[PDB]
Design an enzyme around this catalytic site. Structure first.
Site, PDB file in Angstrom:
ATOM      1  N   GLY A   1      31.938  54.529  12.045  1.00 33.15           N
ATOM      2  CA  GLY A   1      31.869  54.497  10.594  1.00 33.15           C
ATOM      3  C   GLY A   1      32.841  53.476  10.027  1.00 33.15           C
ATOM      4  O   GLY A   1      33.564  52.794  10.755  1.00 33.15           O
TER       5      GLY A   1
ATOM      6  N   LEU B   1      35.533  54.102   8.186  1.00 25.39           N
ATOM      7  CA  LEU B   1      36.911  54.528   8.433  1.00 25.39           C
ATOM      8  C   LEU B   1      37.215  54.575   9.928  1.00 25.39           C
ATOM      9  O   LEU B   1      38.309  54.184  10.354  1.00 25.39           O
ATOM     10  CB  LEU B   1      37.190  55.896   7.793  1.00 25.39           C
ATOM     11  CG  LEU B   1      38.600  56.492   8.043  1.00 25.39           C
ATOM     12  CD1 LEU B   1      39.685  55.591   7.499  1.00 25.39           C
ATOM     13  CD2 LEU B   1      38.765  57.942   7.500  1.00 25.39           C
TER      14      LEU B   1
ATOM     15  N   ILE C   1      28.712  65.747  16.611  1.00 25.41           N
ATOM     16  CA  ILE C   1      29.553  66.882  16.235  1.00 25.41           C
ATOM     17  C   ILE C   1      28.744  68.118  15.833  1.00 25.41           C
ATOM     18  O   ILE C   1      29.306  69.206  15.713  1.00 25.41           O
ATOM     19  CB  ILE C   1      30.531  66.486  15.099  1.00 25.41           C
ATOM     20  CG1 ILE C   1      29.776  66.102  13.824  1.00 25.41           C
ATOM     21  CG2 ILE C   1      31.435  65.354  15.552  1.00 25.41           C
ATOM     22  CD1 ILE C   1      30.639  66.221  12.538  1.00 25.41           C
TER      23      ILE C   1
ATOM     24  N   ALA D   1      31.339  62.130   9.180  1.00 24.99           N
ATOM     25  CA  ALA D   1      31.022  62.837   7.944  1.00 24.99           C
ATOM     26  C   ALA D   1      29.662  62.388   7.448  1.00 24.99           C
ATOM     27  O   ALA D   1      29.165  61.332   7.834  1.00 24.99           O
ATOM     28  CB  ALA D   1      32.060  62.590   6.845  1.00 24.99           C
TER      29      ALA D   1
ATOM     30  N   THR E   1      37.774  65.256   0.494  1.00 23.01           N
ATOM     31  CA  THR E   1      37.311  64.446  -0.623  1.00 23.01           C
ATOM     32  C   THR E   1      37.874  64.957  -1.942  1.00 23.01           C
ATOM     33  O   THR E   1      38.085  66.157  -2.132  1.00 23.01           O
ATOM     34  CB  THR E   1      35.766  64.413  -0.679  1.00 23.01           C
ATOM     35  OG1 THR E   1      35.340  63.672  -1.821  1.00 23.01           O
ATOM     36  CG2 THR E   1      35.190  65.822  -0.803  1.00 23.01           C
ATOM     37  N   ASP E   2      38.095  64.017  -2.866  1.00 28.33           N
ATOM     38  CA  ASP E   2      38.359  64.359  -4.256  1.00 28.33           C
ATOM     39  C   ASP E   2      37.219  65.156  -4.878  1.00 28.33           C
ATOM     40  O   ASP E   2      37.437  65.853  -5.879  1.00 28.33           O
ATOM     41  CB  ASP E   2      38.638  63.066  -5.064  1.00 28.33           C
ATOM     42  CG  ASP E   2      37.402  62.162  -5.216  1.00 28.33           C
ATOM     43  OD1 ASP E   2      36.575  62.071  -4.271  1.00 28.33           O
ATOM     44  OD2 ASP E   2      37.271  61.519  -6.276  1.00 28.33           O
TER      45      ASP E   2
ATOM     46  N   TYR F   1      27.698  67.803  -1.619  1.00 21.71           N
ATOM     47  CA  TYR F   1      28.662  67.127  -0.766  1.00 21.71           C
ATOM     48  C   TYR F   1      30.017  67.821  -0.842  1.00 21.71           C
ATOM     49  O   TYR F   1      30.564  68.251   0.178  1.00 21.71           O
ATOM     50  CB  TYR F   1      28.746  65.646  -1.174  1.00 21.71           C
ATOM     51  CG  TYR F   1      29.908  64.914  -0.559  1.00 21.71           C
ATOM     52  CD1 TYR F   1      29.947  64.658   0.810  1.00 21.71           C
ATOM     53  CD2 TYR F   1      30.989  64.515  -1.334  1.00 21.71           C
ATOM     54  CE1 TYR F   1      31.027  64.008   1.389  1.00 21.71           C
ATOM     55  CE2 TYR F   1      32.077  63.862  -0.767  1.00 21.71           C
ATOM     56  CZ  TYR F   1      32.092  63.613   0.594  1.00 21.71           C
ATOM     57  OH  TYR F   1      33.170  62.964   1.158  1.00 21.71           O
TER      58      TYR F   1
END
Ligand SMILES: NC(=O)c1ccc[n+]([C@@H]2O[C@H](COP(=O)([O-])OP(=O)(O)OC[C@H]3O[C@@H](n4cnc5c(N)ncnc54)[C@H](O)[C@@H]3O)[C@@H](O)[C@H]2O)c1
Ligand SMILES: O=C(O)Cc1ccc(CO)cc1
Length: 288
Positions: A14, A16, A41, A64, A106-107, A132
């Site tokens: 990904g 990140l 996963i 994710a 996450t925010d 999400y």
């Protein structure tokens, strides 16, 4: 084991995961890197098999599902599988093998009902309104339950050179469209993956206290997606048009203000660039 640190990166291809692999490469740190085609996963048998072979002591969980609008409908099942089941599988594996788990959240775990100028702290109660954000909060609770050593890092609006993101979407659209519409009533802050990877490694390198940390890049002033898009596309012959969130019917009810307070991350000693400085560095790094 007790004497050897053994790092496992999930979601390693990904945006990140790739940033983090390159960061550990720079620092001469070894790791095992897996993504869907090596350790799905959502398959607890595959996760167990990999952990039995690798025996990690430290896991950077970058896998994710992050398509917010798709998670409301066409990706609802995959969103749940990757962000709930997958999170549980990784937290259970880390607890069984005694590994420290760095979980990126996450925010969007917050409801966003917070006046412009106010910010969400790590102790605030999540109440997410997007599919999400709901599944990421369930992932937090799984990590809390099963990984005794953990860092949950809530990040936001993630962009970087090694995968898909808002920046490349905007640039791709600007290649053939003269007018773009971006919300000016959703408040938060971009996060460059390089800043996030550096912070991930700052917590673990310095053995900061386990628990929750908010990490986005910083801002001197209010920031909306429109502000971000306007800066992204300032060298482009496209008009970025501010709209509010009712201008077009959106599938996901995104938080209106999910700006994160960064005091706890700052108290670690980590220096957080503004998102403007980070974006400029992102453009310089991409030339490599
Ligand atoms: N995109 C954003 O703005 C944003 C915002 C808030 C939080 N986050 C969090 O950032 C973390 C990762 O960020 P990203 O931008 O690199 O996402 P990304 O979509 O670029 O990649 C994440 C990796 O997860 C992999 N993956 C998906 N399902 C998998 C599975 N079943 N098994 C193994 N791998 C799987 C994906 O293939 C991908 O390589 C996530 O925890 C995300 O929730 C992102
Ligand atoms: O909207 C999308 O599909 C990408 C995305 C995901 C998560 C967040 C929350 O930080 C923001 C943007």
């Amino acid at each position: 084991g007790p004497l050897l640190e053994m790092i496992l990166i999930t979601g390693s291809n990904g945006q990140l995961g790739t940033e983090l692999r390159y960061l550990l490469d720079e620092r001469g740190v070894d790791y095992v890197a897996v993504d869907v085609a090596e350790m799905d996963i959502t398959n607890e048998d595959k996760v167990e098999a990999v952990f039995a072979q690798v025996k990690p002591t430290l896991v950077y969980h970058c896998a994710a599902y992050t398509a917010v609008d798709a998670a409301e409908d066409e990706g609802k099942a995959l969103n749940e599988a990757i962000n709930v089941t997958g999170s549980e599988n990784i937290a259970k594996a880390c607890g069984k093998y005694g590994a420290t788990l760095v979980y990126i959240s996450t925010d969007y775990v917050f409801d966003g009902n917070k006046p412009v100028g106010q910010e969400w702290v790590e102790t605030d109660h999540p109440d997410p309104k997007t599919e999400y954000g709901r599944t990421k909060r369930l992932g937090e609770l799984a990590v809390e339950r099963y990984a005794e050593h953990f860092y949950i890092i809530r990040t936001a609006w993630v962009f970087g050179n090694y995968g898909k993101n808002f920046v490349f979407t905007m640039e791709q659209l600007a290649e053939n469209h003269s007018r773009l519409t971006v919300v000016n009533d959703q408040h938060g802050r971009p996060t460059w993956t390089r800043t996030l990877a550096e912070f991930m490694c700052y917590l673990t390198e310095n053995q900061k206290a386990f628990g929750y940390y908010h990490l986005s890049n910083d801002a001197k002033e209010d920031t909306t997606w429109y502000d971000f898009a306007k800066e992204i596309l300032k060298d482009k012959a496209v008009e970025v048009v501010p709209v509010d969130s009712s201008a077009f019917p959106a599938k996901a009810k995104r938080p209106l203000n999910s700006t994160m307070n960064l005091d706890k991350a700052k108290a670690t000693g980590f220096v957080i660039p503004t998102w403007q400085e980070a974006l400029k560095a992102f453009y310089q790094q991409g030339l490599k």
